[PDB]
Amino acid sequence: ANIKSQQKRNRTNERARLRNKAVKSSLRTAVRAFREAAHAGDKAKAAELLASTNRKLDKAASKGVIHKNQAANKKSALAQALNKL
Amino acid sequence: ARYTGPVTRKSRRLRTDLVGGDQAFEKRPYPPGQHGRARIKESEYLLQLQEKQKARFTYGVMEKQFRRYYEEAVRQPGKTGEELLKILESRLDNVIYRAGLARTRRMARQLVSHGHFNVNGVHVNVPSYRVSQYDIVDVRDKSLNTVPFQIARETAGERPIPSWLQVVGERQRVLIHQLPERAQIDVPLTEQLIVEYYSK
Amino acid sequence: AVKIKLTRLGKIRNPQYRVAVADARTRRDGRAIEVIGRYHPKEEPSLIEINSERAQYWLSVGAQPTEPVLKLLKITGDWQKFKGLPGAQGRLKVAAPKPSKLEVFNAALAAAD
RNA sequence: UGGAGAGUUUGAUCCUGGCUCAGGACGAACGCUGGCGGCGUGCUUAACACAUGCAAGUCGAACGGAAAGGUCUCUUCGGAGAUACUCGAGUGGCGAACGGGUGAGUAACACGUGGGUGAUCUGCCCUGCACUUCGGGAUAAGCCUGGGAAACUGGGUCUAAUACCGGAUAGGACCACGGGAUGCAUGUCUUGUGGUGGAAAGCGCUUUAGCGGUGUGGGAUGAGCCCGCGGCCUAUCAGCUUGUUGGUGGGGUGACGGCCUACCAAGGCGACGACGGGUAGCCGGCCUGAGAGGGUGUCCGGCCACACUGGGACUGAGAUACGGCCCAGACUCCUACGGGAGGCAGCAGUGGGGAAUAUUGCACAAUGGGCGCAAGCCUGAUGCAGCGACGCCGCGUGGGGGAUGACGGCCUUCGGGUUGUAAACCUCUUUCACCAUCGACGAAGGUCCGGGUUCUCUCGGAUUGACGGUAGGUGGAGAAGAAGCACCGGCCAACUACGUGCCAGCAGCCGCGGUAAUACGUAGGGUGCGAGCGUUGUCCGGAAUUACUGGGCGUAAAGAGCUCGUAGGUGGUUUGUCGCGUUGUUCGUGAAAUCUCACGGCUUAACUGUGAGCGUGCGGGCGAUACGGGCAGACUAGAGU
Ligand SMILES: [Mg+2]
Ligand SMILES: [Mg+2]
Ligand SMILES: [Mg+2]
Ligand SMILES: [Mg+2]
Ligand SMILES: [Mg+2]
Ligand SMILES: [Mg+2]
Ligand SMILES: [Mg+2]
Ligand SMILES: [Mg+2]
Ligand SMILES: [Mg+2]
Ligand SMILES: [Mg+2]
Ligand SMILES: [Mg+2]
Ligand SMILES: [Mg+2]
Ligand SMILES: [Mg+2]
Ligand SMILES: [Mg+2]
Ligand SMILES: [Mg+2]
Ligand SMILES: [Mg+2]
Ligand SMILES: [Mg+2]
Ligand SMILES: [Mg+2]
Ligand SMILES: [Mg+2]
Ligand SMILES: [Mg+2]
Ligand SMILES: [Mg+2]
Ligand SMILES: [Mg+2]
Ligand SMILES: [Mg+2]
Ligand SMILES: [Mg+2]
Ligand SMILES: [Mg+2]
Ligand SMILES: [Mg+2]
Ligand SMILES: [Mg+2]
Ligand SMILES: [Mg+2]
Ligand SMILES: [Mg+2]
Ligand SMILES: [Mg+2]
Ligand SMILES: [Mg+2]
Ligand SMILES: [Mg+2]
Ligand SMILES: [Mg+2]
Ligand SMILES: [Mg+2]
Ligand SMILES: [Mg+2]
Ligand SMILES: [Mg+2]
Ligand SMILES: [Mg+2]
Ligand SMILES: [Mg+2]
Ligand SMILES: [Mg+2]
Ligand SMILES: [Mg+2]
Ligand SMILES: [Mg+2]
Ligand SMILES: [Mg+2]
Ligand SMILES: [Mg+2]
Ligand SMILES: [Mg+2]
Ligand SMILES: [Mg+2]
Ligand SMILES: [Mg+2]
Ligand SMILES: [Mg+2]
Ligand SMILES: [Mg+2]
Ligand SMILES: [Mg+2]
Ligand SMILES: [Mg+2]
Ligand SMILES: [Mg+2]
Ligand SMILES: [Mg+2]
Ligand SMILES: [Mg+2]
Ligand SMILES: [Mg+2]
Ligand SMILES: [Mg+2]
Ligand SMILES: [Mg+2]
DSSP, X not given: OOSHHHHHHHHHHHHHHHHHHHHHHHHHHHXXXXXXXXXXXXXXXXXXXXXXXXXXXXXXXXXXXXXXXXHHHHHHHHHHHHHOO | OOOOSOSSHHHHTTTSOOXXXXXXXXXXXXOOSSSOSXXXXXXXXXXXXXXXXXXXXXXXXXXXXHHHHHHHHTTSSSOSHHHHHHXXXXXXXXXXXXXXXXXXSHHHHHHHHTTOEESSSOEEOOTTOBOOTTOEEOBOTTTTTOHHHHTTTSOSSSSOOOTTEEEOSSSXXXXXXXXXXXXXXXXXXXXXXXXXXXXX | OEEEEEEEOSOSSOOOEEEEEEESSSOTTSOOSEEEEEXXXXXXXXXXXXXXXXXXXXXXXXXXXXXXHHHHHHHTTTTHHHHTOSOOSOOOOOOOOOOOHHHHHHHHHTTOO
């Protein structure tokens, strides 16, 4: 890069990329554990995995990583996935 | 630009004495040059063209400037020959001629061009300045006690003054009453062949 | 941010201006949201007009004026009647007028006789 | 409120019908010539390749620090003291997505205009309401070392924060059941119970220095997405389509949706031109025209697309990320051959292409923007200047007398005629240039400074203008310093002489030239224009020669060899009704500029300010029902039996 502040901002783009990626990668595994627990038909674990997964989607939305409507659309699809079970 | 040439030559070709009083004209009223005494073909285009030339060399107006005067005259309500001769009669060098301050048209043009006048207390030096209704036409205090401005003090009688403007006593100043309509316009020319010239 | 700013639209040496409500992400002579007055800094006081009832709308909704427009609102009393400052009356001043076209013309006919 | 024609087919005529011309226009170019000013405007071709300098930073009132400066400073006699204003590098915040450029791609919801969004997002800004609570682990810098020719990079220690991380409590997240209003089907809005949940950060202070933080209600603004309608050529392109068209369940996004996926259905589109081919950024507008139309998209203003070529994501409120990232490709450069670097379609400039398009200018004084509590710093945006008659507009180069129709030139019927009041001479005035002098407006503000406590307010001070010692004023001298270009057979204003002899040449068309050429060349005279005048190219006009306004087809070009019939277009008399067409009115919208009109300001004009039209349309509401159409009947004249 040429401008002095674009060298600076190239360094802070990567640190924000590693921060956002580690948060988004853990949200995939939180959903994936719930999809397996809801495929066991338990409703014992899947009641309390649903409470901890929906809590993680809220905390990602408060850290600016996902959008608040993305947290809403994913919590509503996991909660209704338990009502069928 | 100006013309800056002989003045009787373009009164002989147009067959009409354009300046006031000429003994060189009326010894030869026929057109100048070596084929002057001919009996010439009078085209319809020639009657429209030479009528437009009678106004350009009366008022001292170039062709691009005279055409812009036609652009608004055809575009104002009323007529077209009325409003073209009105806005030619409102130019400052023509106003000075009608008031009697100059003998001819060309000396009326320098006295405006050399800045011997004011209008509303404002020093002007443009000869195609168009005066409006209620415009005072004053004169510079430096230009008083000058030869061409005091040689026209005693000659205030031999030419008539039109009705639309007015001259007063030793404080020389010219007051415009209204814009001149038709009847107080001096007529060496008709006003319809100019209008028919620009339709070609 | 919504700004109340000036808009240069005169000749080369004659900067006429319009008091316009625009966006900050916008060039000078672009689309304004609304024109709420004008400003000619070439007369001898100046020529200042603000709409002053649409100015009271745009200030009451959050439009931040620029620093020449903020001076103009203090002269017209609009910034004072918005913030609650006591100078809410207009302290603007027009030029001392000229006698009209007819009045000078008759006073030359009165002086010549 | 606004419309002109002429030439040319014939021995002559009328008609038909082509061709050519006169006018306007330009981002122009070339030829001849060239005084000044005001104000516009300038790579149309190679989205070709680019040397050098600049075009985006800011905050110490976020934080650790202390390389530079200024200090109280030890006193070294060139070594000191973070305690300290101040500040290079660094972390952190905000900005960098705006502004500026270009027009390659694009025939498309790209643009224009009008709607929808009960299908959505929106940093900073404004306001209502809540809150601002406990803790923790690092690390850049620094310091010490390793690799590398470089560009850069490794490791060990070390230190902060408004950096980061984890809890407490906080409804506009989520699930289920409720009422209550609402309609336009999915529903939306408002409230209730129960069960799950998710924030924050401090820093400064002369002693009213003051700035910030987070969650939620509502605005404002910017934006996304869908739809009606409108603006090219081509059928010597006629079958296109398989995530294709629809459904269901999941996924996905800010949001609807085949946007993606699985499964099921077998559709969708097309002669009202699908699918192809060619070309093109679209528009406000500009040019022309009496209008209707036709041509065009240059300055300026709007939206879109791109940023060496192609592809991709990251960060963020927001990304075609020009002056960011990563991969691939072409090209240029560096290398110790292991590897690295670069992207003017920013401003200025260079090369090249071309008929052809400018300075490696000045300033942040004004206006707009970024950051900052603020002073300020940044700004090739912008304001201005330079260069080019490139355009438009304006003004000069003299004026008043003056016959002795002077000299000369040209013509001559040798008498004269003409250039020509034109010179000469006498005389008047100096706009501009020139010299001298004064000297701005843009600045009811920018900074400091007393009162004016605050905010504000000015008595009033200080200095602050790139343009610029410019414009403008005043003085000085003298007609003094300043005119050319085309054309003259007809259209079409303006005619003779000599030279030449189908030669040399001219010419837009008909044509002129072969020994008396108003058409070739020069001369005199003349006409049209004038700091310009011609020529070429291009567009419209004339052209009623694509004809809606506004044409034709017996013989001039033009009725299919004839019929049947599909789509389509058109339809007798009458009752009732609907109100789609049509028509009246009103509201919303049709930006600004440009254009028309009227006033104002630049000494006038161009130019520019304001007001009103215009914006022919489109949407919403409410009237009318004659005509057209729809719907529900009647009729017998057309048609058929
Ligand atoms: Mg920074
Ligand atoms: Mg993993
Ligand atoms: Mg979902
Ligand atoms: Mg003919
Ligand atoms: Mg024949
Ligand atoms: Mg013939
Ligand atoms: Mg030239
Ligand atoms: Mg030359
Ligand atoms: Mg210029
Ligand atoms: Mg180009
Ligand atoms: Mg620093
Ligand atoms: Mg800040
Ligand atoms: Mg950009
Ligand atoms: Mg620590
Ligand atoms: Mg916490
Ligand atoms: Mg909680
Ligand atoms: Mg499938
Ligand atoms: Mg779904
Ligand atoms: Mg589906
Ligand atoms: Mg193209
Ligand atoms: Mg016509
Ligand atoms: Mg353009
Ligand atoms: Mg351009
Ligand atoms: Mg290039
Ligand atoms: Mg993001
Ligand atoms: Mg950038
Ligand atoms: Mg660049
Ligand atoms: Mg350039
Ligand atoms: Mg060349
Ligand atoms: Mg500035
Ligand atoms: Mg500023
Ligand atoms: Mg310029
Ligand atoms: Mg010039
Ligand atoms: Mg002088
Ligand atoms: Mg003739
Ligand atoms: Mg001869
Ligand atoms: Mg000749
Ligand atoms: Mg001129
Ligand atoms: Mg031509
Ligand atoms: Mg033509
Ligand atoms: Mg036509
Ligand atoms: Mg015909
Ligand atoms: Mg027929
Ligand atoms: Mg025949
Ligand atoms: Mg025939
Ligand atoms: Mg037949
Ligand atoms: Mg046949
Ligand atoms: Mg039919
Ligand atoms: Mg009928
Ligand atoms: Mg029908
Ligand atoms: Mg308009
Ligand atoms: Mg005017
Ligand atoms: Mg005026
Ligand atoms: Mg205007
Ligand atoms: Mg209506
Ligand atoms: Mg019958």
